[PDB]
């Protein structure tokens, strides 16, 4: 059972940092040469950076280099760029004249560190269209902020809510390294119309910002 | 110029089968060996099997009893069939020449196969309208809430692709109803709200449903 293990499994670094990822295989790859390094953005097909341990394909930025031998491989990024956030995979080819396998490392997630950036906060009442469905969704958007950790609290008629909201976060911007986040509070139409003031409070470090609206106003 | 275009994907009932094909352009499918690979949600890459240029298919041990990888030289295609699918087989499937040791590497775009007993359900699309009493000076945020669909994925574009700057389409969240929901937002110049039309284009290919929603102020 061929195993490829990468070290570390995840890391954070700032633009300009030198970054190293190690991969070790439980047995030597085909011809002691067949290993590639791949870069995957979430959901998208992986893009190959390095092949045959150390060969850089045309068009791949020169800050990527590969090295190693037979069973131990290294990807080096000489100077990290914001677009380099991704999961990096080592891929090996194995076997004999009559048996063939490929194996993948478990992946190393690379996140970009940067200075703190306060979110731009927007709040969206439910649409009349949706209300005609019997359900109401109130949306709070936090735009272009850093770091990822941000407390988002919902208030209905000044009552702090719990259990009735869900969050979702984008991946880092490939130029800005910032995140965006949505928090969605779900109520029934009847519950929604039983209250007047809806607010979302966003807390980051020493700042709290609350955006509110009164139901029925515009 | 050269491309590997993947076709198939969508919802399959447990115990059912999947058939995915990839069409080569710019090269001959029988000149090279091709792998099929998959990625379960939030997990790493997994090799399914490798069809050599010589026409021998080597399957991963876990996949051999249920899988076949074949090629059609006239149509210039490579195909994966898998039967007796289980929920655990839910994943994005890719065709790829991995290029661990050679210059040529190429991947299909990947397609999601969801294995579930549930029925497909097309999304409802609701506006996240920019505050006509706009509250962020020279910038306004607007969007679309895409709610209550199954299975993944939906794709969202704005103005048929003409609008990409400032767009954040959030990852889908699974709701307690077992249905998915997400939001797509964009920030625009507030001055443009009276000048420019904004339409979100939602595609839910698993249900063969398409929605175009004009997002108006107020």
């Amino acid at each position: 059972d061929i195993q490829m293990t990468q070290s570390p499994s995840s890391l954070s670094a700032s633009v300009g940092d030198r970054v190293t990822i190690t991969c070790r295989a439980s047995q030597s790859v085909w011809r002691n040469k067949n290993v590639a390094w791949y870069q995957q953005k979430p959901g998208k097909a992986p893009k190959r950076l390095i092949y045959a341990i150390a060969s850089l394909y045309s068009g791949v930025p020169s800050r990527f280099s590969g090295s190693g031998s037979g069973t131990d491989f290294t990807l080096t990024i000489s100077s990290l760029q914001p677009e380099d956030f991704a999961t990096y995979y080592c891929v090996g080819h194995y076997g004999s004249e009559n048996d063939a396998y490929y194996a993948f490392g478990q992946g190393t997630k690379v996140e970009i560190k940067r200075t703190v950036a306060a979110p731009s906060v927007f709040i969206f009442p439910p649409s009349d269209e949706q209300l005609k469905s019997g359900t109401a969704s109130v949306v709070c958007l936090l735009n272009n902020f850093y770091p990822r950790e941000a407390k988002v609290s919902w208030y209905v008629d000044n009552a702090l809510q719990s259990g009735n909201s869900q969050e979702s976060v984008t991946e880092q911007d490939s130029k800005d390294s910032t995140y965006s986040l949505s928090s969605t509070l779900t109520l029934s139409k009847a519950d929604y119309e039983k209250h007047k003031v809806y607010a979302c409070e966003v807390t980051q470090g020493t700042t709290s910002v609350t955006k509110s609206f009164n139901r029925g106003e515009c | 110029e050269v491309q590997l275009v993947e076709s198939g994907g969508g919802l399959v009932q447990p115990g059912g089968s999947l058939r995915l094909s990839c069409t080569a352009s710019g090269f001959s499918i029988d000149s090279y060996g091709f792998s099929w690979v998959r990625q379960a949600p939030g997990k790493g890459l997994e090799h399914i099997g490798y069809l050599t240029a010589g026409g021998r298919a080597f399957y991963a041990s876990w996949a051999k009893s249920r899988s076949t990888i074949t090629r059609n030289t006239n149509e210039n295609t490579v195909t994966l069939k898998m039967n007796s699918l289980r929920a655990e087989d839910t994943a994005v499937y890719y065709c790829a020449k991995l290029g661990t040791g050679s210059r040529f590497a190429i991947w299909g775009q990947g397609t999601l196969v969801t294995v579930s007993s549930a029925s497909t359900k097309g999304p409802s699309v609701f506006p996240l309208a920019p505050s006509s009493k706009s509250t962020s000076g020279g910038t306004a945020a607007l969007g679309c809430l895409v709610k209550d669909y199954f299975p993944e994925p939906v794709t969202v574009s704005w103005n048929s692709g003409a609008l990409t700057s400032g767009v954040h389409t959030f990852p889908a969240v699974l709701q307690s109803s077992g249905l998915y929901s997400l939001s797509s937002v964009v920030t625009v110049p507030s001055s443009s709200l009276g000048t420019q039309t904004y339409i979100c284009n939602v595609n839910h290919k698993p249900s063969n449903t398409k929605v175009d929603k004009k997002v108006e102020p107020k």
Binding site: G95, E97, A100 | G33, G54, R56
Partner: peptide, 7 residues
């Protein structure tokens, strides 16, 4: 061979 399984 550039890959395994070539026979």
């Amino acid at each position: 061979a550039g890959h395994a399984g070539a026979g």
